[PDB]
Structure formats: structure tokens, C-alpha cells
Design a binder for this molecule. Structure first.
Ligand SMILES: Nc1ncnc2c1ncn2[C@@H]1O[C@H](CSCC[C@H](N)C(=O)O)[C@@H](O)[C@H]1O
Length: 387
């Protein structure tokens, strides 16, 4: 069912795989799933995300693996600019920092939409783990925001403090997770080993310490339940919120609060892989050539940000956030008689806000420091009390 990679791509994946087999052997034959993801997704040079921009796009026939809101439509960035601007104003700051900037479309769109709102930034900082997307980002910015691109900086390291607005779209979902599985007796960790034939397989091990099972005790799990823990995303949000001195941080991503994430019925968890616009469950397929994600558990994200000293600014579905922020007014700026522009825009809005598409599954959580009031983008249907 999955497309076969070309022979040159298979050679890269094979080299990654062979090194990882050797690593698992040297480790004693078992590694946590988080280390497996760390390698296949983020190995320097060889990881899926240590690579260029082809993976981002709209359709299989452009060579991409998955679509994201910035790739889908400029109306996403144009809408997001409204709460970003309000947060800059409320906090008295003048910089934006984006993590995981992809092709640069979100940055170019935010810059041009912020300018149209009368907001000039001192800096738009792009934070990626390595530098392989810098050339495509520069190209996008030159093509789509030519008179504003000069304000962009690609950081090699985070500042100790930051005053401004942080953005990350589909960044939290991409972070390594550990897998846990319910036994007859308590819970264990599901990791990765290598079978007799040299294939990657799941394999279970006990936890080293009892705190580890006790944090899962509240899950109403039957034997066989398997789900994900999200320490990496928690650590990242703490880093962001400890760095933030004044301003806000917005994370847009698919997921749920804890009571929904770890619901009795969600017994297979949320782990999914994306390859050439096919979603499937096998993270051992073509290592380095496909993504592996889990949904975001927003209660733990909330606790992470607030625990590092930030305030919760809001939490709601992407539909409510974008509607509150003015996406319907953004669409109304386009003349309905201009069919070439209007129909694709209306279609993308539908995808961004419909519960059958992105609108309910995707959520937006925000943190702040030095913001006393509420953002308009959270003024209706905020779900903070459910976290
Ligand atoms: N700790 C971290 N800091 C910066 N980027 C990270 C990160 N962890 C993961 N990422 C990056 O986040 C990206 C997720 S893919 C989504 C890309 C883009 N925001 C879009 O919507 O189109 C990847 O490029 C991955 O390398």
C-alpha cells in the first residue's frame, strides 16, 4: 500500500537502520521508543527532520509526506497574525520567535500580515534543530515577504531571555514519546528490540522505578491498553516558558486534555506515521523517510508551562481560535467574483475550521507573561477549565 522509495533514498534509510541495529546491540538489545524516535527523526544528518523541505506540501504528487496549515493556505497565517499582534501590543513587545519553521510560509505570512496590521517587528527569529531548511526558508521569504525578510534571524542557540511572541505549529506532536502498556499486573514500558531476522520489533520491559507506574494509575485501562508519555514535549514547553520574560507563546497542534487523551476507549493510543500522505501505524517502516507523531496531551502541556512560571493565556479548538481571531473577515477580504482566489480560500477555511477536518481535532494553547487581560482569539468557547 505504501509507495516504494527510490533506490537512493532506500540506501540512506538502510545506512540509518544498520547503524541503529548496531546501537541497540551495543545497548544490550533494547531501547525506549523515545530513543528510537530521537534517532530515526532527529539523528544529525540522517534523521527524517535533518533534511530539506520536500516533505512539506499539499499532495502526494508534489513529493510531500503531509500537509500542515501553513502549506494549505495563506489565510492561516493571516488569521494568526491578529492574536499575535494583540499579544505583542498587550505585552509591549516587538519580536516573534517561531520553532520548527518548515518551508518558511508561516513566517512570510505572519510578517506580511503583521505589516498590514501596522506592526513592525525588531526581529523574527527562526529556531530549528539544524540548518537544512534555511535555504528554502530564505527562498520563501524572498518570494512572499521580500521587503520584510531582512528582519529574520536563524538562531543557533536560544537566548537566556526573550521578550515577544513564540509560535509553534505542529511542533509538539513531533517530539519523541515513550510507549507504555497495561499488563495484567500494572504497567510496563514498550520499547524497541531487533528480532532473529534483523527487523525492528516492539518489546516490553519493566519500569526502573515505581513513580513510573503510579502516574498511569488514573487511566481506566484494560489489559493490552497502549499509549504515550510526553516528557520531551513537557521539557520543551518548560524551556520556552522559562525563556519567555514578557509576551506570549502559542502552540497549535492536534490532541486532547488528559481525560480525553487517556480515555478508556483510546486503547491503541494515538501514535501515527505519515509517508507520502498515507497515515499508518508502523514506525519501523522506511526509517528516516517518514514521520512518526503522537497527539498532544494538553493537560501536561498546561502544567509544564505554568510550572515554569508562565500564565495560561487560553486553550480552545482551532475552529474557535481562528473564528474568534477573524478568519471569516479574512476570507471576506477576497472578492467572491474573483473565483480563482475565492474558491480555494473558502475551501481551506472549511478545512481549517470544520469538525470533520482540522477544526475540532486541532487545538491552540497559549501561555503568557506580563499580559493582564484576555485575547480576543480566546473570547468565546475557551476550554481552559477542562484541562
Ligand atoms: N525542540 C525543537 N526545536 C525546534 N524545532 C523542533 C523541535 N522539535 C521538533 N522540531 C521541528 O518541528 C518541525 C515539525 S513539522 C511542522 C513544520 C511547520 N511548522 C509547518 O506547520 O508546516 C520539524 O521541522 C522538527 O524538526
Amino acid at each position: 500500500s505504501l509507495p516504494v522509495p527510490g533506490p537512493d533514498a532506500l540506501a540512506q534509510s538502510e545506512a540509518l537502520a544498520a547503524s541503529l541495529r548496531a546501537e541497540i546491540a551495543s545497548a544490550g538489545g533494547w531501547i525506549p521508543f523515545s530513543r528510537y524516535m530521537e534517532r530515526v527523526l532527529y539523528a544529525p544528518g540522517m534523521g527524517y527532520y535533518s533534511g530539506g523541505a520536500q516533505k512539506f506540501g499539499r499532495r502526494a504528487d508534489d513529493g510531500s509526506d503531509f500537509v500542515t496549515a501553513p502549506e494549505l493556505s495563506p489565510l492561516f497565517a493571516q488569521t494568526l497574525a491578529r492574536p499575535v499582534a494583540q499579544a505583542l501590543d498587550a505585552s509591549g513587545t516587538r519580536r516573534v520567535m517561531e520553532f520548527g519553521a518548515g518551508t518558511g510560509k508561516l513566517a512570510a505570512g505572519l510578517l506580511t500580515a503583521l505589516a498590514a496590521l501596522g506592526v513592525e517587528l525588531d526581529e523574527y527569529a527562526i529556531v530549528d534543530l539544524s540548518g537544512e531548511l534555511r535555504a528554502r526558508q530564505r527562498e520563501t521569504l524572498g518570494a512572499q515577504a521580500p521587503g520584510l525578510a531582512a528582519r529574520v534571524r536563524w538562531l543557533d542557540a536560544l537566548p537566556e531571555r526573550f521578550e515577544g511572541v513564540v509560535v509553534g505549529n505542529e511542533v509538539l506532536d513531533a517530539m519523541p514519546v515513550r510507549l507504555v502498556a497495561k499488563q495484567a499486573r500494572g504497567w510496563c514500558e514498550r520499547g524497541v528490540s531487533i528480532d532473529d531476522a534483523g527487523a525492528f520489533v516492539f518489546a516490553d520491559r519493566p519500569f526502573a522505578r515505581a513513580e513510573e507506574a503510579a502516574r498511569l494509575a488514573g487511566i481506566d485501562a484494560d489489559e493490552g491498553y497502549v499509549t504515550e508519555t510526553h516528557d520531551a514535549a513537557v521539557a520543551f514547553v518548560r524551556t520556552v516558558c522559562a525563556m519567555l520574560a514578557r509576551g506570549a507563546a502559542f502552540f497549535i497542534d492536534y490532541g486532547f486534555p488528559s481525560h480525553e487523551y487517556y480515555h478508556r476507549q483510546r486503547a491503541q493510543g494515538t501514535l501515527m506515521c505519515h509517508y507520502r500522505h498515507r497515515a499508518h501505524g508502523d514506525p519501523f517502516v522506511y526509517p528516516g523517510l517518514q514521520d512518526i507523531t503522537a497527539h498532544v496531551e494538553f493537560s501536561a502541556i498546561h502544567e509544564a508551562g505554568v510550572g515554569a512560571g508562565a500564565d495560561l493565556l487560553g486553550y480552545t479548538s482551532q475552529a474557535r481560535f481562528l473564528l474568534n481571531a477573524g478568519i471569516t473577515d479574512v476570507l471576506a477580504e477576497i472578492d467572491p467574483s474573483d473565483a480563482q482566489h475565492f474558491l480555494p480560500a473558502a475551501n481551506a477555511v472549511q478545512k481549517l475550521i470544520s469538525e470533520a477536518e482540522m477544526g475540532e481535532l486541532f487545538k491552540v494553547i497559549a501561555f503568557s507573561r506580563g499580559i493582564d487581560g484576555a485575547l480576543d482569539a480566546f473570547a468565546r468557547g475557551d476550554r481552559s477549565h477542562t484541562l
